[PDB]
Design an enzyme around this catalytic site. Sequence first.
Site: not given
Ligand code: 0W0
Length: 501
Positions: A242
């Site tokens: 992300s």
């Molecule tokens: C960006 O980095 C993106 N991450 C991914 O899509 C990837 N892995 O995601 C995780 C969750 C680790 C997985 O186990 O699949 C990824 C990208 S490349 C790769 N090798 N892996 C985002 C994803 N979104 C979130 O983690 C997230 C959390 C929330 C959320 C929403 C909300 O309303 C509340 O109250 C709390 N949370 O946590 N929404 O999206 N990661 S990032 O957000 O850190 O960028």
Amino acid sequence: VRHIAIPAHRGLITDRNGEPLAVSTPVTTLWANPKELMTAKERWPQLAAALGQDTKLFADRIEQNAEREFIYLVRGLTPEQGEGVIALKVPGVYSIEEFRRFYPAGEVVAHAVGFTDVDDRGREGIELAFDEWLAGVPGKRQVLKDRRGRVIKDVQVTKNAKPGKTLALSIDLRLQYLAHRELRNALLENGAKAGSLVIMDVKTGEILAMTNQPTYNPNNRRNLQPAAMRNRAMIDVFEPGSTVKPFSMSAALASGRWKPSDIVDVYPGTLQIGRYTIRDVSRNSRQLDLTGILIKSSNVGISKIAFDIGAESIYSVMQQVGLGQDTGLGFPGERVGNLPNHRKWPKAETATLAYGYGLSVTAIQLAHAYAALANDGKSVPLSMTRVDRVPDGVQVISPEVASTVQGMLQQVVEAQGGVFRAQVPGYHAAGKSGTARKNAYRSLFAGFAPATDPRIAMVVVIDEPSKAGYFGGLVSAPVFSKVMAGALRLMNVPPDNLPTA
Ligand SMILES: *C(=O)[C@@H](NC(=O)/C(=N\OC(C)(C)C(=O)O)c1csc(N)n1)[C@@H](CNC(=O)c1cc(-c2cc(=O)c(O)cn2O)no1)NS(=O)(=O)O
């Protein structure tokens, strides 16, 4: 071999303010003419004891090499312990004035400064990179031995020993210490395997701090854990995830097809693409604006914009900002990573590029890329040395688009549901979190501040946090806030979160 080579003084490495970072220390090298040593055998035990070596084992060494005109007794002794052996007055025992590196900030700038081998040649980081600049030219003296090894005449100086040149790094030790301390504290708090943190001057391309965990004391030449010696920030590739969505957004706003107030329907929080299914973590959204796509870090939302604009426009932004490209730094086995490219992009590859799964970058590339974005879309060449005259810089993103993406990123940090842990009290900060599943994870935050006139770009990469919360916005964002607050105050950057009413 006839004449002897006079070791040259290795150039002093300082931080940007003249703080000594690598200092050439006089060490004594003791050698012997074994032909002559063989005539003073009663002296040998004293000699052996004065070198920590075993009496009998030392006598064997000399007896073996009894024909030779030269052999080394011991290298790198302190001049005073070298004096102690010379004080014995053992025949056939001679000395060489040598240089060994002392690193005053030790483990703090270990990876950036690097270290020298047994021969005082650069082996890592700056030491290796600027080896020619730092080494200088060794000397040569004409020696006249009768046949055995008596120091007769030195008629001429032959060729003068040239000292190495001084180098002032772009690093600010004040910022290096804060980044160092905070990264170490993050690791212990999260039980993480590793980490990196890069600080950069968006205006000059200067790397102000580059720290990694684990680290090592380069003054302690024993044990040397190769894992602790890895300059991860420059040599460890990772999927940025992300943290690349601001670049896909730059391509969107640049295409003419998107504006921040536009809407993308991300319901049901999944999107099926042939054989693969793009997925969002929070799946309680329908309509989201472009800022909302960034705030919620919606993979579905960004993949939909990607399909509309085409992957080629996204690839181009990323390539121009330097993701998966040579930094021009010319550092020791520095990794370049990989930015995938296609003639015809399939739908699955277009989406993955847009959300950072399809790609390998280094912490330095990511920071540099955020630097160009922060510096109004102008990429200035990276430097590890103090930049007095700033080179031209390249407009890689139009100022208007860069300015708009900056505002969206400021809202990622400041808005409701945003990455509040990234907030820098007293200032307007901007950035984007990342979380990459390698279960094993990598926690990322990339940002810049102050939003009104960006000065610093920062990347916080924490590898394998083992605590309950593993998200970038939870693990890395507090480190960004902590380091940012301090780095800006250390640089006397005036606070910008000021009144308007
Ligand atoms: C960006 O980095 C993106 N991450 C991914 O899509 C990837 N892995 O995601 C995780 C969750 C680790 C997985 O186990 O699949 C990824 C990208 S490349 C790769 N090798 N892996 C985002 C994803 N979104 C979130 O983690 C997230 C959390 C929330 C959320 C929403 C909300 O309303 C509340 O109250 C709390 N949370 O946590 N929404 O999206 N990661 S990032 O957000 O850190 O960028």
